[PDB]
Amino acid sequence: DFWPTLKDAYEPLYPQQLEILRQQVVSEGGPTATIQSRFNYAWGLIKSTDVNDERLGVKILTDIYKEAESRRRECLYYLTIGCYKLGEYSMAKRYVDTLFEHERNNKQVGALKSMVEDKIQKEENLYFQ
């Protein structure tokens, strides 16, 4: 499976498109909607520049991750990105490490893990200054 890049994650949708994604979920019954439609909305929210929307997207994605069964690996990658955008680096690290266990040779997962580790190391420096 080929996934979005971290660069892709910082390319927002038009507000009008994000609203169409929201309405699709509502039309499917919200929490009883398909995993795919809720995932699409969550990812749109994560891509938004608005931090409150990004937070909402990660919350939704965390909900559907628990329900996702076979799509759980994909969810972990997107969750890592969402947490990374929010500066939730400790959570991003946990998610990406779990994903890495089944994706040890995957270039995309390795790249994301390295970016997470960059930010973790940034904070680590502060405890010896």
Swiss-Prot record:
Effect of mutating L76P = In fis1-L80P; no interaction with MDV1; mitochondrial fission is blocked; DNM1 assembly at punctate structures normal as in wild-type
What molecular function terms (GO) are annotated for this protein?
Answer: lipid binding; molecular adaptor activity
Stretches of the chain found on the membrane's Cytoplasmic side: 1-123
Keyword Transmembrane helix assigned to the entry: answer is yes
State the compartments where it is located.
Answer: Mitochondrion outer membrane
The answer, when asked if Glycosyltransferase is one of the entry's keywords, is: no
Write down the superkingdom of origin: Eukaryota
Biological process (GO) annotations held by this record are:
apoptotic process; mitochondrial fission; peroxisome fission; peroxisome organization; positive regulation of mitochondrial fission
Q: Keywords on this record?
A: Apoptosis, Membrane, Mitochondrion, Mitochondrion outer membrane, Transmembrane, Transmembrane helix
State any GO CC term.
peroxisome
Remaining remarks: Present with 2410 molecules/cell in log phase SD medium.
Tell me the subunit arrangement: Interacts with DNM1 and MDV1.
Its biological purpose: Has a role in mitochondrial fission. Has a role in outer membrane fission but not matrix separation. Required for targeting MDV1 to the mitochondria. Regulates the assembly of DNM1 into punctate structures, in the mitochondrial tubules, promoting mitochondrial membrane constriction and/or division.
Tell what the record comments on domains: The C-terminus is required for mitochondrial localization, while the N-terminus is necessary for mitochondrial fission.
Q: Which family does it belong to?
A: Belongs to the FIS1 family.
Per its record, how is this protein called by name? Mitochondrial fission 1 protein
Q: Which organism is it from?
A: Saccharomyces cerevisiae (strain ATCC 204508 / S288c)
Gene designation per UniProt: FIS1
